[PDB]
């Protein structure tokens, strides 16, 4: 079976490259972040513009939702993270402590903590209520390209240009595993599978890989796209068929069959690098966003 994703909406408004798109867990909203220093909110099902959220002083590279869809955290070049109340648009907290650009961010499932990764080569863990840095992980020896909590928040996976993926025990800070193949290309994205058993990792050699991290083994490899320059998000599409979804530097959205590794769809329309894809939590919907010769978000819908 192959998906039949088809373009439903293009969403425009950001005045510079879009960095990140994320669907709210309750499925009503898409949040977009951009080099133009702005967060924008759109309806998930029609892409209707809802509001702009602002306050960061430099461009934004990531945004993530709290589990209750009430809060957003953003990661900015201004070396801060901001906790936002979506409904009011106010900045609730400014998270300071990184000494270089903040590049990536995520809530834990309970949404009482935020993880961040920075150009300063560290991972930071933040208390959402107080906005205080709980812990700093000297996580890597190069910029941290992604950080992600597992299904219950007890683990953090980070990726870095130093070529490593590291799994951290959230509470103890201990590095439980360091993962690397037989080469060391920069790792530009990583995230746990929904079941927590795997990490999906992008490396800047045009390769995605599915690792059983417990066993420390690569179970699947996905190729055919173009990824050598940008930290492009990748997804497990789970609502219908089990796909792997990623943007690509040839301006396409790639969709692979997770089991077989075959490319099953390529979504055309973007006119620049598709930096970010997101999968709707209940509907077979993909959101994708592109860099500075495009600056738009597209919503794609599939029957399966």
């Amino acid at each position: 079976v192959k998906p039949n994703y088809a373009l439903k909406f293009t969403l425009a408004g950001h005045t510079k490259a879009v960095s990140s798109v994320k669907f709210s867990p309750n499925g009503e909203w898409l949040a977009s972040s951009s080099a133009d220093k702005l967060i924008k909110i759109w309806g998930a099902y029609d892409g209707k513009f809802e509001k702009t959220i602002s306050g960061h002083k430099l461009g934004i590279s990531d945004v993530a939702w709290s589990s209750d869809s009430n809060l957003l955290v953003s990661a900015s070049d201004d070396k801060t993270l901001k906790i936002w109340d979506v409904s009011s648009g106010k900045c609730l907290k400014t998270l300071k402590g990184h000494s270089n650009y903040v590049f990536c961010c995520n809530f834990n499932p309970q949404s009482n903590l935020i993880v961040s990764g920075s150009f300063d080569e560290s991972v930071r863990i933040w208390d959402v209520k107080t906005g205080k840095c709980l812990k700093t992980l000297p996580a890597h020896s190069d910029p941290v390209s992604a950080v992600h909590f597992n299904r219950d928040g007890s683990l953090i996976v980070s990726s870095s240009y130093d070529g490593l993926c590291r799994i951290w025990d959230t509470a103890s800070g201990q590095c439980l595993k360091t993962l690397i193949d037989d080469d060391n290309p920069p790792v530009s994205f990583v995230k746990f599978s929904p079941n927590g058993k795997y990490i999906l990792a992008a490396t800047l050699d045009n390769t995605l890989k599915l690792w059983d991290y417990s066993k420390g083994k690569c179970l699947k490899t996905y190729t055919g796209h173009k990824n050598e320059k940008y930290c492009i998000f990748a997804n497990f599409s789970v609502t219908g068929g089990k796909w792997i979804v990623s943007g690509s530097e040839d301006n396409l959205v790639y969709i692979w069959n997770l089991q077989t590794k075959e490319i099953v769809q390529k979504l055309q329309g973007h006119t620049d690098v598709v930096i970010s894809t997101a999968c709707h939590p209940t509907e077979n919907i993909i959101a994708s966003a592109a860099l500075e010769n495009d600056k738009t978000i597209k919503l794609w819908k599939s029957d399966c």
Binding site: S19, S34, G59, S61, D62, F103, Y230, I275
Partner: peptide
């Protein structure tokens, strides 16, 4: 910075 090569 994610938007930069």
């Amino acid at each position: 910075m994610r938007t930069e090569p």
